[PDB]
Amino acid sequence: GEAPNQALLRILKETEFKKIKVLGSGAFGTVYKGLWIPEGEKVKIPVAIKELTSPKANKEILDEAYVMASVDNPHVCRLLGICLTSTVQLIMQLMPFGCLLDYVREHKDNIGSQYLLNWCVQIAKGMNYLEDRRLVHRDLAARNVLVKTPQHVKITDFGRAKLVPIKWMALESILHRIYTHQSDVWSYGVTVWELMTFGSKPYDGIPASEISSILEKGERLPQPPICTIDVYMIMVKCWMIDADSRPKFRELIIEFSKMARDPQRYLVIQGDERMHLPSPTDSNFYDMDDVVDADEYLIP
Numbered sequence: 001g002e003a004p005n006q007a008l009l010r011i012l013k014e015t016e017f018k019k020i021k022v023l024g025s026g027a028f029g030t031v032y033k034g035l036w037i038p039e040g041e042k043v044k045i046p047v048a049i050k051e052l053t054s055p056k057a058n059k060e061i062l063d064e065a066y067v068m069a070s071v072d073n074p075h076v077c078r079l080l081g082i083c084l085t086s087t088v089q090l091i092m093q094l095m096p097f098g099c100l101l102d103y104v105r106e107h108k109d110n111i112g113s114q115y116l117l118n119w120c121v122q123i124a125k126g127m128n129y130l131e132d133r134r135l136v137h138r139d140l141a142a143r144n145v146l147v148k149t150p151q152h153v154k155i156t157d158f159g160r161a162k163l164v165p166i167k168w169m170a171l172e173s174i175l176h177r178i179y180t181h182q183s184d185v186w187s188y189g190v191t192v193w194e195l196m197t198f199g200s201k202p203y204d205g206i207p208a209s210e211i212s213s214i215l216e217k218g219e220r221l222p223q224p225p226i227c228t229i230d231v232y233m234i235m236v237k238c239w240m241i242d243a244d245s246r247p248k249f250r251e252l253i254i255e256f257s258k259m260a261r262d263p264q265r266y267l268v269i270q271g272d273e274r275m276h277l278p279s280p281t282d283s284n285f286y287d288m289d290d291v292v293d294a295d296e297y298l299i300p
């Protein structure tokens, strides 16, 4: 059959989690900001703690734990461990800049072409990795891309990942519930559109029930003002009826990489290049002592 999944599920003690405060709540559940202080290791890891006491809630979150514990890529979010309390909690890496959707909306005036094109390469890299691991995300959107640093993004939310977000879904998925890596490619094109429009809602005001009809007639999301025909043509290719005619994620990495070498040729932004976003070599970016990021804290 398939290859044995030898990933390790780390059961973490409640007593090892300090300075807990709410980051956000919604349909997704509740995400808390915390500090993981393991054993006598002299490390304080900034963490995010997710929870959806119901047996069906524990089933769904343990399915997300299963997928999230099985992934290992710089552009994908890995599970650090789980905490078994009244409800099952997922322990993950704190992404200080939150989701990419809210980031593009709040920092629109300082987001340049190089940042936008790099985010596209990075999302495609993480997506290609999921394809290698034979995983179909089934919920790629700008809301599910987290910002570690303005120059480093990662894909998350494995609640729907396998081996309804209508406005992000490929037409085969809306009509026949068919999900493939090529259906994820359609969602990637919508994710790209969301970025290029600085967080615009796709098909705003249009009800979900009308989307399938809109797509069948031949209607697609419009060309963002900053997008050259070069960038939009890539988005359009992700939205073709025939899934096999859509680009492969490895081709999106190549296409956006070439473009990111001359970003002003592919994205037209007023007051470009001069736009600055916080870097790790800048003041007040970071007890403070013994703080180690999850990407630098390997195994026990």
Ligand SMILES: CC[C@H](C)n1nc(N2CC(C(C)(C)O)C2)c2cnc(Nc3ccnc(-c4cnn(S(=O)(=O)C5CC5)c4)n3)cc21
Pocket (backbone or CB within 6 Å): 023, 024, 025, 028, 029, 031, 048, 050, 077, 092, 093, 094, 095, 096, 097, 098, 099, 143, 144, 146, 156, 157, 158
């Ligand atoms: C995505 C929204 C979630 C509430 N959230 N908010 C953050 N903070 C906002 C705060 C400021 C204001 C300072 O910007 C940063 C934040 C930081 N790290 C992680 N960490 C991770 C890591 C891996 N996965 C997840 C994860 C998985 N599912 N979800 S979700 O269901 O909340 C997603 C659909 C929104 C988050 N979170 C998640 C974070």
